[PDB]
Amino acid sequence: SVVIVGKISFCPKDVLGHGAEGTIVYRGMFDNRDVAVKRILPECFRESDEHPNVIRYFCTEKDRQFQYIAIELCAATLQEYVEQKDFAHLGLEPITLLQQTTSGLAHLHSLNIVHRDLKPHNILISMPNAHGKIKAMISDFGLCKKVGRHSFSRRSGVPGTEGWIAPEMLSENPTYTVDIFSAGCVFYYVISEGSHPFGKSLQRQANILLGACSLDCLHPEKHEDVIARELIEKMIAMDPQKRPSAKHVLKHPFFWSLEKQLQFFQDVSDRIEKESLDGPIVKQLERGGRAVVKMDWRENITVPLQTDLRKFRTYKGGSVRDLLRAMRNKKHHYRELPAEVRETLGSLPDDFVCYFTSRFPHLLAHTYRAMELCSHERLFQPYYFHE
Ligand SMILES: Clc1cc(NCC2CC2)c2ncc(-c3ccc4n[nH]cc4c3)n2n1
């Protein structure tokens, strides 16, 4: 059986879920798209602003009783993506998912919209498009699994959504900073494969009020975890005014490709070449630098790179600057290096950069913080967000 209401069709047997006041969601079609079709009693009293990572409400039609609303169809929630056993990613990896979620949020904030209740239940994973690709999209309605059915609601604290309360309830009208906190919590949730940064649910609110977060799954000597921690801690900062904007989160190293990581190192090295050892920039760079370099970096690299460097009496092993200079030197002269050196370093850029970030897990985090001094400069505008 089939119901046609203008440009929207659906089969009444294909029920996906139920909502309040006899609202119902069916699977259907609109304009050769598979869509969710929400049927509602009408309540009384912008296509040009669409974005791939915010859910689309395509069309509204009506018969004599109901309105029918065509809505962009999801395969799963982020809750299911993260939690379900053996869930196929289908080519959508966590960092990309979070990247897309933050883009949708930056878009909403660019329109002066605050979500206020961003959680795993309302970040939806799309059906695969014509090109076999899936995406994250932020929804106003959250979905909670209940066989082949889901409850949908816009409300915070409905059954199923208990450990994710709207941040405004744990505290001025809501600003972007509530969304960033929630995003920060979602970031950790995905990365930790289901944990909350404010602990188990019975103590979670109490922990949020005091800023007692614990990012235990992030190892303090792994480059990827050092970067993720750096960002996530800023996003869930107890003080709302220290939280970065969505566009600011998007510029963070957490999202940089290996090529971009290597280019950053190359650029700071170029920037600090003629800089005096006693100037403000090199001082910022050498402060706390002994731990970053593992006291002597020349004792923490491979024997073939060690041997090739021995000629360079210039490079000091206690120095963060000289490690960056050694890196930039060997990237620039890579072609002309001995076979054994190209082999130990591996290919440009991906193996090369990982040679150093695996050995020196604080190098990028430390260099990123230190080089904020040059953030307004033209060369570094790709790496930092400006107000
Ligand atoms: Cl019950 C439901 C189920 C969906 N997919 C199929 C399930 C395997 C996952 C699904 N995809 C989008 C929506 C949706 C999205 C925004 C809405 N606003 N009001 C109602 C809305 C409904 N749903 N709902």
**Domains in the chain, please, with CATH?**
1-72 (3.30.200.20), 73-257 (1.10.510.10), 258-387 (1.20.1440.180)
Nearest Cα neighbor of 117 from 71, 67, 148, 163 is: 163
State both tokens at 384: 């930092």
Distance (Å, whole) CA 329 – CA 291: 23
Beta pairing, strands 33-40 & 57-62: unpaired
Q: Is 344 annotated as a binding residue?
A: no
User: What are 254's two structure tokens?
Assistant: 């957490």
Is 20 annotated as a binding-site member? yes
Angle made by CA atoms 169, 173, 176, in degrees to the nearest 5? 90
User: Measured between alpha carbons, how far is 168 from 179 in angstroms, rounded to an integer?
Assistant: 10
The CB-side HSE value for 209 (13 A sphere, CA atoms) comes to 7
Residue 237: φ, ψ to 5°: -50, 130
What is residue 83's three-state secondary structure? Answer: helix
Q: Within 6 Å (CB) of ligand 1, which residues are found?
A: 16-17, 25, 36, 38, 55, 71, 73-76, 139, 141, 143, 150, 152
Determine the distance separating the centroid of ligand 1 and the alpha carbon of 25, expressed in angstroms: 7
The token pair that represents 276 in the structure block? 């005096």
CA distances from 65 to 50, 68, 221 (A): 29, 10, 62
Integer Cα distance of 194 and 168 in angstroms: 23
CB 94: neighbour CB atoms within 10 A? Answer: 14
Quote the CA–CA distance of 315 and 74 in Å, as a whole number.
55
Q: What are phi and psi of 152, to 5 degrees?
A: -125, 140
For this entry, resolution in Å reads 2.1
DSSP string, 11-77: EEEEEEEE-GGG-EEEEEEETTEEEEEEEEPPP---GGG--TTB--EEEEEE-SS-EEEEEE-EEEE
Residues near 66 by beta carbon (within 8 Å), at least 6 away in sequence: 39, 40, 41, 42
Alpha-carbon distance values, 177 to 39, 181, 234, 236 (Å): 34, 6, 11, 9
| Cβ atoms 380, 371 nearer than 8 A | yes
Buried b (16+ CB within 10 A) or exposed e, 279-311: eebbebbbeebeebbbeebbeebeebbeebbee
Cα(283) to ligand 1 centroid in Å equals: 54
The H-assigned helical ranges of 200-288 are 201-210, 223-235, 246-250, 258-271, 280-286
- Two tokens, residue 70: 């065509």
How many residues make up the chain in this entry? 387
To the question of whether residue 119 is assigned a binding role by annotation, the answer is: yes
Q: How was this structure determined?
A: X-ray
From the alpha carbon of 23, which atom of ligand 1 is closest? 20
Query: First and final CA of the chain: distance in angstroms?
Result: 57
Q: Pick from 129, 82, 88: which is nearest to 101 by CA?
A: 82
For residues 330 and 347, what is the distance between their CA atoms, to the nearest angstrom?
Answer: 12
| 109 CB-near residues (< 8 Å, 6+ apart) | 176, 179, 245, 246, 247
CA separation for the pair 62, 64 (Å, rounded): 7
Is 19 annotated as belonging to a binding site?
Answer: yes
Beta bridge partners of 231: none
| CA–centroid distance, residue 159 to ligand 1 (Å) | 17
Helix (H) or strand (E) segment spanning residue 320: helix 320-332
Nearest one of 39, 31, 36 to 63, comparing CA atoms: 39
Q: Which residues make Cβ contacts (< 8 Å) with residue 321, sequence separation at least 6?
A: 272, 277, 282, 285, 286
Q: Rounded to whole angstroms, how far apart are CA atoms 375 and 299?
A: 32
Which of 18, 33, 35, 73 has the most ligand 1 atoms within 8 A of CB, as the residue to mutate?
A: 73
Query: Which of the listed residues 10, 16, 59 should we mutate to test ligand 1's pocket, taking the one with most ligand atoms within 8 A of CB?
Result: 16
> What Rg do the C-alpha atoms of the chain give, in angstroms?
25
For residue 126, give the 3-state DSSP assignment: strand
User: Cα(6)–Cα(303) distance, rounded to whole angstroms?
Assistant: 73
Instruction: Tell me the catalytic residues.
Output: 117
Residue among 69, 86, 190, 90 nearest 134 (CA) = 90
**How wide is the angle at C-alpha 114 spanned by C-alphas 49 and 59, nearest 5°?**
40
The protein residue whose alpha carbon is closest to atom 4 in ligand 1 is 74
Q: What angle do CA 86, 89, 95 make, to 5 degrees?
A: 125
